[PDB]
Structure 1
Amino acid sequence: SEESQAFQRQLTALIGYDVTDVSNVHDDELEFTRRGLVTPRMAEVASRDPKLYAMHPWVTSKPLPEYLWKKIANNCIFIVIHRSTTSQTIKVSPDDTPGAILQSFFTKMQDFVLRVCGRDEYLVGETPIKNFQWVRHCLKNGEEIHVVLDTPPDPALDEVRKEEVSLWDCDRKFRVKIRGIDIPVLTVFVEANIQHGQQVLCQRRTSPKPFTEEVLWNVWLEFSIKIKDLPKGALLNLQIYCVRLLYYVNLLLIDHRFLLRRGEYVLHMWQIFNADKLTSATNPDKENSMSISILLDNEMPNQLRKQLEAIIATDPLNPLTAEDKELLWHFRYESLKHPKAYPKLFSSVKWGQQEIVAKTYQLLARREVWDQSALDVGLTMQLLDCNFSDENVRAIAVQKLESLEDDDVLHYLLQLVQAVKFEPYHDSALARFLLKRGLRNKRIGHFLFWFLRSEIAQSRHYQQRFAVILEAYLRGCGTAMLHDFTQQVQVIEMLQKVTLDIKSLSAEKYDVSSQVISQLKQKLENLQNSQLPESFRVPYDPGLKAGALAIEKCKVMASKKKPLWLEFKCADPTALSNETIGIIFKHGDDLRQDMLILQILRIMESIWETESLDLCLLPYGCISTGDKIGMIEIVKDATTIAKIQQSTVGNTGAFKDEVLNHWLKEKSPTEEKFQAAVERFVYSCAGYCVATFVLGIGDRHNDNIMITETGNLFHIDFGHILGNRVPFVLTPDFLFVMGTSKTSPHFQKFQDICVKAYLALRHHTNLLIILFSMMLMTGMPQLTSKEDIEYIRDALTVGKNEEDAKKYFLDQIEVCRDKGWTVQFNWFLHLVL
């Protein structure tokens, strides 16, 4: 229909990709997936509470932190309620449901709901107020809980549109006819590898022929694998060699319909590990890319129990030898009693053997131990990586994810969305899981949209698959969100244009012009006049709605990339703050890497949360919105650590100790408040000391480090260092705020938090190892070597004794004392040659 044809154009503009495009496919896999996803989409729309979906209560069932329980002069805590300048503070119990406070209103002074002042965050549902995320945020910040007596938002605004083995198999060895290669404009050979979970089952090469625009072979490449032995999820990896790899392409030997791939194929190749090297998608640039023409016509002993128990224990990056694999496979029923052995056991399977594969499925039936076990995110995710191409293995991991509460989904989301790059087929248990969790909760859904949209907008390798998952979501989120994302995209597209034009205007030559700041205000006034939405939603903080720009407050930052500095008025008039919303728009670096580091930082804070530690990290908002471009959060009242040095000193290099504490006393209204800033610095520094070290992003210029007037420290621009000696940034100016020029009471405390922190991350070695190895593979293609991945092993000191490693970190701190300003001076010198 005419109104159905227009709905798809609204989807296309939102997605950033035309999903109804068949000009780059050799099968109907994406269409089979659009169609396949219709049922889990309609099933989650129909299953969700309309009243609770509309209000998206953000809650946790995690035990209330020990540090935060102490914040209350226990048992009865007070919160402020508003309703037309009628504001009364009410003492409420932490175990009180919102309704208990709602019916306490009739007694104090239903048809109305408790909403937070300034943001779209309702305190609703049958949950104790201690379990609401906003309340916990306010407690820790030393901030007053302010709510307004709003009315419940209409679930009718969330209105949804109505509309929607293998048998070619025989004993014969598998063969593929390589006809030749063609590019529009040494010697060249083609490599044919049968891959399953990165493990090469069989490898065959061609006779090298002279390098020409049309190379022909007409050769049949018979493999050692029988047609019957081919496992579903296996890839035919075609690679072109000089000995250097030039081009590569993949083709899924078994269909999404379980059919062996028979026929003539002209595959457009990708030009030169990386997750992009795994893609089933062909190159869209059919005009410039090389193509490949192909044809397809077809009781246990103690000494040994000690050995596999030692294997079970070794980290996710320790390789298994044939000895280990054979042992694991033979004593597989024992290995099944230990859930932390499943990644090792499933990597001991001979996937190129139907017999072994069937036995693995027989072994999978007796999942009793696996299912009854407590969900290990580090173990679950380990089975979703590149080493696992089996659908049934991947599903048992996706099964454990079904038990994550919306709080923990939102937490591992980016990495679960990235884990989709490891799936053999477009339709998968994981893709579906992500769809259900998103369609169910607006916060999971809002983030899902941008997370998918970032990859769609800058990867020709996975945009097709990701675009399909997005259309499926967009069709079930509702008209409210469908309108809400529309105004978010309109604002981003306009601003991104402004960002690139102003980057072009500025020379790149160190300093910024008066006419550049004038042209910005002039271009912002043209956007503000008309076309730009009256109000929109902040993509990194969906709670906050941004109204109209503060054109006078907007400027162009004095950096080599020339980013935008934008201030926005809050759309809410209940904003009990004057404060504008500050967003930085920047073209230059891949903010997909900042996004990743920022997410692990959020994980480390949660790891510390369980050990009752708050290390005051500041993982600010950041969304990659397109090719080498995106938006960033402005952390209010913060300044560059180098800019504080550049103030007193005025120029590069001298660097005085006291300067830091000088600015701290300068920017603290009371010495009684300065004592709290000293306290906030001592562990906000400790947090970033540990974190950056573990992730190997500790060697950074003091320009890339910031501090608030309240003394909270934070590292910035992570993609800058990732697009390329000391352990971390601990400098004499920081050591001066502690009282060390030697030991002091604060520096003693710094090390104590550092040791308690480095050891707390170590109790989660395997989680951090998979998150890191996955992050490098799916996000940063520069650092995708065996050696780059293995950094987290040495950093976390795997296998080392708890006391022996506690010394390794205290020794690392001493390398900072050894080298006071040695490389901070070298960095300052380097960034000016």
Structure 2
Amino acid sequence: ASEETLAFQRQLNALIGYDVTDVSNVHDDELEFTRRRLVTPRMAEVAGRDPKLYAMHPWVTSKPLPEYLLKKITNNCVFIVIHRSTTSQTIKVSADDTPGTILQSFFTKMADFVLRVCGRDEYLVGETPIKNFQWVRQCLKNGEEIHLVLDTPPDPALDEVRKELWDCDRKFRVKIRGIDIPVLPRTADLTVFVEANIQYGQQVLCQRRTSPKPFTEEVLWNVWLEFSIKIKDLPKGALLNLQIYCQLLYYVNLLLIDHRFLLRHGEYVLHMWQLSFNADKLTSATNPDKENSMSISILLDNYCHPIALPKEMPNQLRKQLEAIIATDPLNPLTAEDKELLWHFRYESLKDPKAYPKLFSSVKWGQQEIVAKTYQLLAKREVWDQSALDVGLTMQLLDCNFSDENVRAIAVQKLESLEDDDVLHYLLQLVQAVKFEPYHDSALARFLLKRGLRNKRIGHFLFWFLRSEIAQSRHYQQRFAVILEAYLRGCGTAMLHDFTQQVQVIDMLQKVTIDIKSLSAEKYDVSSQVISQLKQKLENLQNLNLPQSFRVPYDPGLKAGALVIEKCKVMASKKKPLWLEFKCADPTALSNETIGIIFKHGDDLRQDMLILQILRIMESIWETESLDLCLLPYGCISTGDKIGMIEIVKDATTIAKIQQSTVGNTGAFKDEVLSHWLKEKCPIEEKFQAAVERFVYSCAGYCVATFVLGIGDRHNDNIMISETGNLFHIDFGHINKERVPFVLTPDFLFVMGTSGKKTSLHFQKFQDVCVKAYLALRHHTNLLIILFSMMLMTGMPQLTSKEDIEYIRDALTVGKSEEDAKKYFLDQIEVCRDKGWTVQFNWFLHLVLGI
């Protein structure tokens, strides 16, 4: 109430990018209600987290040491280098030593502090073997030395937190007064009607319409729509989905039972959303644009105040039930399916992998059945004792499930995840909040909790939520609330860092878009815009631009001043900015700059989402002991059609390589690529390792790009580094010739296949591909749900079942390893037939605008 907290709220909203306090666009107090109930889990988390380990955010894994890593360590002994002001000595110890033992034994080698990584804010502290430290492992895989500088621990005082019924059997019914819209489309003579639906888990319980009338600024009806489902049957989380067809054009939703288990009555003037299926169609939020959006007026039974108060087998038949429990996640169920599935509730409760199927066979539209379902969840021994399955858990948090308890059990198994895992899945869990029927939920609380309990998670949770608040008006309110609750308990240091980051970004957002303004339809990096570019950075770098700030996609990296010289404007289409900074950390064991790219034009949430499935993929290969050398570079969506991207050093586009050894034409030489790498690394040893890198990097992207359904793209959207690593890029948007994945002649060439014959490295390729293509099939269900969620919360279009199903054909579900093994190796053949065919077509399409 004072001026203190008042100003505090002011800045909080500036970091969120939305005024959470705002109450102009709401028909109830669910938001504020949610802000208050979060205050508890927040404070409860702040108090329970050790200030020390928290301030140092140790990054560890309790997973085994992979086969490819176990291969490098020589008899439980690793070499590390410790630094201290010019002084540098190497000490080899067992991979099982504790960071304390590394110090205790240190003091007794040469005649209070902590071991940090040189150039990064990464501390190796805690009761864990040095082998369980991600950094340590990263160095091993890349075959790099482990240089650590001994300095003083960060004062855990910098993370200080500031001062703090079922008897109304009457049928349900709702009256539609009329829809209103200030202006209508040019093409007149239209017909429209209101379709009122009783939704739940995306399935329709009941449906009613109105008499189709001509389309005009005002279209009254004053018609009562009486449904069938009794008020006693309305389940918590049911939505009254009101829609309008002309084709569906506008839609709006409203929870029938509020956050207090009360019914909904009274008059309502809901401002609808327009349609350009997907997460947005499910939002309870109303459209803020009240001066241009279509509105609708309704009325709910002005009754009293109802309150939904809180609560042997024929062997052969079995074989039938099982055939369902073993059915892929995409194949729907039939009448008999659910009926047969339901009847044997307790028998289907013995196998976890059946829950998704079982719970979707429930008639939530019947109060009786719901009550029984909960009786089932009473004895969850079989579930609570089951081993966590992220795949399965996810399946319960999608659009198909709107029941609190059901979803709550999924969230309940997530609690079992260690910080390392929470980070692999963070993006998808954050996107899953969109399927929650209320703003306050088990999942919303779980993200808050885990964010406040670890700085890394908290860091990415900030950015992920922030991207949705800045771009999504459908969910920003709910997300603005979840963020606030996080910024109110992350500490004063993090609160400060986020400020520096937001500041730097906002200042670079202006340039990025102000520079693109000059020439857009014709890529011509003017000689004047070059001087005008460096010049703008000059104004910013004056004293308003934060000297130092953490790189959003790589929190451990601290960026300093801008190396204005190396900064430029890429001669691309959307004219992105190529910036470079110095590493703010003076203990950095190098001088290399930090490259960051700012682009406008492409939706960077897609790239974000895509790069994340990749991380998961690499992780999956880790379990099956495999390394494909993917390079999922950092990418963060910051706002509408804009964000940053990590810059991979010593890397070039595969097209530019052909456009230099040949020219700006479509004639592609097969030996060009190899000639490039050879002259890049004269040292035979490097070239010998660079060629093998390609073999793996190339294979790795071929499988991932295929399963994801994005293997067919131009040559310019693909890169290779001077170390031989090939990696795809720019995932903005993605009768004729087609190809499964890019495996051009110049690639095969570098593998030995100078023509259409087998080779040494080439055989290694096919061996690794198939090998990785199988490692992913073991996680078919996990990929299905991910690919499925990604399309519902990452694609502007109204993706359908046909869209998701592709993932099922790519993974060849229902087949044996043999059939699948050959299937993949044949796709590799489809590429051997096209050769340069496809690439040449992409050249005619993009370059020649044909």
| 1:701/1:828 contact within 8 Å kept | yes
Deviation (angstroms), 1:187: 1.3
CA deviation digits over 1:493-520, x for unaligned, max 9? 0000000000101243122111111111
| 1:586/1:631 contact within 8 Å kept | yes
Deviation (angstroms), 1:673: 1.4
Deviation (angstroms), 1:780: 1.1
CA separation in 2, counterparts of 1:277 and 1:418?
Answer: 14
Q: TM-score, normalised by structure 2?
A: 0.96
CA deviation digits over 1:705-729, x for unaligned, max 9? 0001000000000113399910001
| 1:740/1:747 contact within 8 Å kept | yes
Which residue of 236, 261, 266 maps to 1:263? Answer: 266
Q: Secondary structure at the match of 1:351?
A: coil
Q: Secondary structure at the match of 2:599?
A: strand
Q: Secondary structure at the match of 1:496?
A: helix
Identity rate of aligned residues, in percent?
A: 96
| 1:723/1:782 contact within 8 Å kept | no
CA deviation digits over 1:107-128, x for unaligned, max 9? 1119100000001000100110
CA separation in 1, counterparts of 2:223 and 2:797?
Answer: 36
Change (3 A) 1:724 1:197: farther
CA separation in 1, counterparts of 2:75 and 2:525?
Answer: 54
Deviation (angstroms), 1:73: 2.5
Change (3 A) 1:14 1:783: same
Deviation (angstroms), 1:62: 0.5
Q: Secondary structure at the match of 1:215?
A: strand
| 2:171/2:228 contact within 8 Å kept | yes
| 2:175/2:222 contact within 8 Å kept | yes
Question: RMSD in angstroms over aligned alpha carbons?
Answer: 1.9
| 2:520/2:574 contact within 8 Å kept | no
Change (3 A) 1:17 1:321: same
Deviation (angstroms), 1:92: 1.2
CA separation in 2, counterparts of 1:822 and 1:634?
Answer: 30
Deviation (angstroms), 1:142: 1.1
Q: Secondary structure at the match of 2:522?
A: coil
| 1:755/1:806 contact within 8 Å kept | yes
CA separation in 2, counterparts of 1:300 and 1:197?
Answer: 31
CA separation in 2, counterparts of 1:783 and 1:556?
Answer: 35
Map of 1:615 onto structure 2 = 628
Q: Secondary structure at the match of 1:158?
A: coil
CA separation in 2, counterparts of 1:781 and 1:146?
Answer: 45
| 1:777/1:784 contact within 8 Å kept | yes
CA deviation digits over 1:789-823, x for unaligned, max 9? 11100011110111011111011000000110001
CA deviation digits over 1:9-33, x for unaligned, max 9? 1101100000010000000000000
CA separation in 1, counterparts of 2:391 and 2:116?
Answer: 36
CA separation in 2, counterparts of 1:382 and 1:341?
Answer: 11
| 2:737/2:838 contact within 8 Å kept | no
Change (3 A) 1:775 1:156: same
| 2:282/2:435 contact within 8 Å kept | yes
CA separation in 1, counterparts of 2:358 and 2:453?
Answer: 35
Deviation (angstroms), 1:91: 0.5
Deviation (angstroms), 1:656: 0.7
Deviation (angstroms), 1:337: 0.4
CA separation in 2, counterparts of 1:815 and 1:400?
Answer: 43
Q: Secondary structure at the match of 2:565?
A: coil
CA deviation digits over 1:369-397, x for unaligned, max 9? 00000000000000000000000000000
CA separation in 2, counterparts of 1:315 and 1:507?
Answer: 47
CA deviation digits over 1:268-312, x for unaligned, max 9? 000001100000000000000010000001511121101111101
| 2:398/2:435 contact within 8 Å kept | yes
CA deviation digits over 1:79-100, x for unaligned, max 9? 0001111111000110000000
CA deviation digits over 1:520-563, x for unaligned, max 9? 10100000112100111100000000000001110000111000
Q: Secondary structure at the match of 1:533?
A: coil
Deviation (angstroms), 1:783: 6.2
Map of 2:695 onto structure 1 = 682
CA separation in 2, counterparts of 1:705 and 1:323?
Answer: 49
Q: Secondary structure at the match of 1:293?
A: strand
CA separation in 2, counterparts of 1:710 and 1:72?
Answer: 23
| 1:772/1:789 contact within 8 Å kept | yes
| 2:392/2:782 contact within 8 Å kept | yes
Map of 1:352 onto structure 2 = 365
CA separation in 2, counterparts of 1:149 and 1:31?
Answer: 47
| 1:637/1:709 contact within 8 Å kept | yes
CA deviation digits over 1:452-489, x for unaligned, max 9? 00000011100000000000000000000000100000
1:587-666 alignment, distance < 5 Å: 587-666=600-679
CA deviation digits over 1:21-79, x for unaligned, max 9? 00000000000000010000000000000000000000000101111111123321110
Q: Secondary structure at the match of 2:847?
A: coil
The answer to which of 576-585 and 102-111 deviates more is 102-111
| 1:783/1:789 contact within 8 Å kept | no
| 1:168/1:260 contact within 8 Å kept | no
Map of 1:43 onto structure 2 = 44
Deviation (angstroms), 1:168: 8.1
Q: Secondary structure at the match of 1:552?
A: helix
| 2:119/2:585 contact within 8 Å kept | yes
Q: Secondary structure at the match of 2:259?
A: coil
Change (3 A) 1:519 1:631: same
Deviation (angstroms), 1:3: 0.7
Q: Secondary structure at the match of 1:18?
A: coil
Q: TM-score, normalised by structure 1?
A: 0.98
CA separation in 2, counterparts of 1:303 and 1:181?
Answer: 56
CA separation in 2, counterparts of 1:200 and 1:76?
Answer: 62
| 2:193/2:211 contact within 8 Å kept | yes
| 2:520/2:575 contact within 8 Å kept | no
CA separation in 1, counterparts of 2:111 and 2:374?
Answer: 53
Deviation (angstroms), 1:771: 0.2
CA separation in 2, counterparts of 1:606 and 1:251?
Answer: 40
Map of 2:836 onto structure 1 = 821
CA separation in 2, counterparts of 1:495 and 1:176?
Answer: 50
CA separation in 1, counterparts of 2:197 and 2:81?
Answer: 66
CA separation in 1, counterparts of 2:432 and 2:698?
Answer: 32
Q: Secondary structure at the match of 2:361?
A: coil
| 2:520/2:573 contact within 8 Å kept | no
| 1:102/1:110 contact within 8 Å kept | no
CA separation in 1, counterparts of 2:335 and 2:92?
Answer: 65
Change (3 A) 1:110 1:202: farther
CA separation in 2, counterparts of 1:220 and 1:830?
Answer: 55
CA separation in 1, counterparts of 2:111 and 2:811?
Answer: 53
CA separation in 2, counterparts of 1:712 and 1:722?
Answer: 34
Deviation (angstroms), 1:105: 1.7
CA separation in 1, counterparts of 2:166 and 2:417?
Answer: 41
CA separation in 1, counterparts of 2:385 and 2:329?
Answer: 22
The answer to which of 713-722 and 725-734 deviates more is 713-722
The answer to which of 542-551 and 110-119 deviates more is 110-119
The answer to which of 435-444 and 747-756 deviates more is 747-756
| 1:506/1:516 contact within 8 Å kept | no
Deviation (angstroms), 1:615: 0.4
Matched, 1:811 2:826: yes
Change (3 A) 1:507 1:764: closer
CA deviation digits over 1:641-682, x for unaligned, max 9? 001111100122110111111111111131121111111110
| 2:267/2:299 contact within 8 Å kept | yes
| 1:722/1:780 contact within 8 Å kept | no
Stretches of structure 1 that go unaligned for 5 or more consecutive residues are none
CA separation in 2, counterparts of 1:724 and 1:53?
Answer: 54
Matched, 1:200 2:204: yes
| 1:587/1:630 contact within 8 Å kept | yes
Map of 1:791 onto structure 2 = 806
CA separation in 2, counterparts of 1:429 and 1:491?
Answer: 34
Map of 2:595 onto structure 1 = 582
Q: Secondary structure at the match of 2:158?
A: helix
CA separation in 1, counterparts of 2:590 and 2:682?
Answer: 20
| 2:650/2:721 contact within 8 Å kept | yes
| 1:454/1:624 contact within 8 Å kept | yes
The answer to which of 746-755 and 464-473 deviates more is 746-755
CA separation in 1, counterparts of 2:142 and 2:591?
Answer: 19
Change (3 A) 1:282 1:783: closer
| 2:568/2:578 contact within 8 Å kept | yes
Q: Secondary structure at the match of 2:106?
A: helix
Aligned length: 829
